Design a protein around this nucleic acid. Structure first.
Lengths: 49, 158, 48
DNA sequence: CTTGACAAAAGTGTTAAATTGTGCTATACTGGGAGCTGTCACGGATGC
């Protein structure tokens, strides 16, 4: 579940980043993020009740 | 046009070697693609066989076209915008197109600036991008490791 | 896979998401070097 | 407890090197954004 919503935060990290730019140099290599997802799931395993 | 084992570059990402024709399901009836591979990064690529030459999938410089590029480095130059914004823009653009002559030229005037007046922390990043891509295709054409290519570029200057 | 809507050029790339904690043997994860555990939760099942 | 000599601790003057504060970039960008639940009792203002 936390993966679902966290990866949705990452989805924000995708759809928003891919239009500020130039479609010329483009690939999920530069379009994919970590911290939204990795830190969401990092958050579930500790601060949660 | 592109045969199975044609060694060609697929910009901007960098050099690599293609592999072959495939049918990948896209939209309606499957259209032929060039599976194209790359050396270091492990990811595949599919380039439309429709117009691969106009889509930015191009050939690789022959082993004989190296000296024109090295010369476009040592003495090579080109006009650049005044405002730092537009300058960065154009640098990014030439770093997009993949045109080897163009990129070599840009790297030429930029490098010419780094050794004379100075270079910002932006224009220099793009400059190194150019030198690296150059190292890639000069390594691919001349069948040498990146060391000897970058050493050809260091031969241009010192 | 990153596919352009216009050129129809498929550019496929594999990426690295991050480091996700994996379960140990007895069923207790190790977070920050300390053995911890996820206690089950309970709620009224979704529906009408 | 005293005088001169002298090493170091300390004072001060002037600069080089760093740190920090400011202004501006011209194609065109022109009304957000995220959701949450399974009380309960009474007192007061407020809408019937």
């Amino acid at each position: 579940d936390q993966f679902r919503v966290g990866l949705a935060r990452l989805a924000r990290g995708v759809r928003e980043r891919m239009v500020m730019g130039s479609p010329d140099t483009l690939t999920p290599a530069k379009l994919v993020n970590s911290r939204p997802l990795e830190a969401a799931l990092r958050e579930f395993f500790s601060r949660s009740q | 046009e592109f045969r199975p084992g044609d060694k060609v570059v697929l910009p901007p990402y960098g050099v690599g070697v293609v592999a072959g024709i495939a049918q990948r399901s896209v939209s309606g009836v499957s259209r032929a693609y060039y599976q194209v591979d790359f050396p270091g990064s492990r990811s595949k690529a599919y380039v439309p066989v429709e117009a691969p030459h106009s889509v930015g999938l191009r050939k690789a410089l022959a082993p004989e076209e190296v000296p024109v590029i090295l010369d476009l480095l040592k003495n090579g130059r080109m006009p650049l915008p005044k405002q730092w914004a537009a300058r960065h823009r154009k640098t990014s653009e030439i770093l997009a197109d993949g045109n080897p002559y163009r990129i070599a030229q840009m790297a030429g005037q930029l490098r010419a600036w780094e050794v004379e007046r100075g270079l910002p922390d932006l224009d220099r990043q793009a400059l190194r991008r150019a030198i690296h891509l150059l190292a890639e295709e000069v390594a691919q054409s001349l069948e040498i490791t990146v060391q000897e290519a970058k050493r050809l570029f260091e031969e241009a200057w010192g | 896979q990153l596919i352009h809507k216009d050129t129809g050029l498929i550019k496929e790339d594999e990426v690295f998401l991050g480091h996700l904690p994996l379960m140990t043997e007895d069923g207790s994860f190790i977070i920050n070097g300390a053995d911890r555990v996820i206690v089950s939760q309970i709620h009224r099942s979704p529906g009408v």
